[PDB]
Structure 1
Amino acid sequence: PPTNPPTTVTKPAEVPSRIWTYVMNADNAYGKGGDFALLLSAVIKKESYFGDGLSGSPSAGDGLMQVQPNTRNAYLSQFSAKYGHAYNHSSEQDQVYMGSLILNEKIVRFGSIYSGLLHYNGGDYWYPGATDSYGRPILADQYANTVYAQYKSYGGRY
């Protein structure tokens, strides 16, 4: 279906339309021409399953991009400065805005998509065999591999 303008990135079929709108808004905030939306779609698929994959997880309450309470707290002032309003955890749009701010930070700071993803999953000090607060194995390398491949499969250009 032809768009005005022609550059409009097409939603992957498997990405729910509510999620697409969240990630497009985030993409707009970072001027990424729709490419970041594709990356964010891949991340959200892995983290939650667009919200469907959280039931029974001990970190279910962390929402769509699985930002831990202490991390959300650390980034409150920066979120407000970037987006113009206080972070509201009950808002799925905000959850995505917060996660995407953190992910953008990692990508910019470490200099690549792959490192952004690895560090988004494991933090800045990840090692093989590392463990999160709940005692779950953090497979940061596999995460980066999976999510990057998914981003590419979605038609990511970088």
Structure 2
Amino acid sequence: TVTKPAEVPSRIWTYVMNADNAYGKGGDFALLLSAVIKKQSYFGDGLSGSPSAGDGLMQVEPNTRNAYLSQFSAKYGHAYNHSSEQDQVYMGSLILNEKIVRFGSIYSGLLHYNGGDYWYPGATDSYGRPILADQYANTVYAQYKSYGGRYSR
């Protein structure tokens, strides 16, 4: 505990481990972030073709990135740079950590990361796509555990 999952590209592992270090999570957060990135962008390979392609590795929506800019700068010591893949991961990590702490659990953190705080079945994203936040949380939590995750909170 813990090892890089074989299927996670080594550049991505570095980003998530840097994020893990910033929150003192012993490598466990990095496993969760790996699962999130696999689902959101497939490490960057599943982006092309999508209206939300430009939102990067963790697919944080523009209005959501905008709300967290000052907090990002405070946490990481530099202004958010969307062209930086490490910053993309740092931003997604900050928001997911915030949700997990605020709502009280990983599952709920994942659900509200994907759906927002006021998700309901039939809610749509900034591109008008239906958000299956419950299914997202289920499948990302399973992937997290499959990578060797060991927490619920």
Please indicate the TM-score interval, normalised by the length of the shorter structure: over 0.9
Residue 154 (str. 1) matches residue 147 (str. 2): yes
Deviation of 1:29 (Å): 0.1
Match of 1:19 among 7, 12, 24: 12
Q: Deviations over 1:65-94 (max 9, x none)?
A: 011111111111100110011100000000
Q: Distance in 1 between matches of 2:99 and 2:45?
A: 26
Shift of residue 129 of structure 1?
A: 1.4
CA distance in structure 2 between the partners assigned to 1:63 and 1:48 by the alignment: 7
Q: CA deviation at 1:134?
A: 1.6
Counterpart CA distance in 1 for 2:12 and 2:130 is 27
TM-score normalised by L of structure 2: 0.97
Contact kept? 2:37, 2:57, Cα under 8 Å: yes
CA offsets 1:86-130 (integer angstroms, 9 cap, x no match): 100000000000000000000000000000000000000001111
Aligned to 2:105: 112
Contact 2:124 2:131 in 1 (8 A): yes
Whole-angstrom CA distance in 2 between matches of 1:84 and 1:24: 17
SS of structure 1 residue aligned to 2:43: coil
Q: Supply the distance in 1 between the matched residues of 2:71 and 2:43 (Cα, whole angstroms).
A: 25
Alignment check: 8 A CA contact 2:111 2:137 kept? yes
SS at match of 1:50: helix
Unpaired runs of 5+ residues, structure 2, are: none
CA distance in 1, matches of 2:109, 2:4: 23
Contact kept in structure 1, 2:61 and 2:126, CA below 8 Å:
no
| Aligned equivalents of 1:127, 1:141: Cα separation in 2 | 9
Matched residue count: 151
Aligned-pair Cα RMSD in Å: 0.7
SS in 2 for 1:18: helix
How far 1:133 moved relative to its partner? 2.2
Structure 1 unaligned blocks of 5 or more: 1-7
**TM-score under structure 1 normalisation?**
0.94
CA distance in 1, matches of 2:126, 2:95: 19
Correspondence for 1:53 among 43, 46, 52: 46
| Pairwise CA distance, 1:21 | 0.2
Structural mapping, 1:48-87, within 5 Å: 48-87=41-80
CA contact (8 A) 2:95 2:113 kept: yes
**Percent of residue pairs bearing the same amino acid type:** 99
| Cα deviation 1:17-64 (Å, max 9, x = unaligned) | 000000000000000000000000000000001000000100000000
Distance 2:11 2:2 in 1: 16
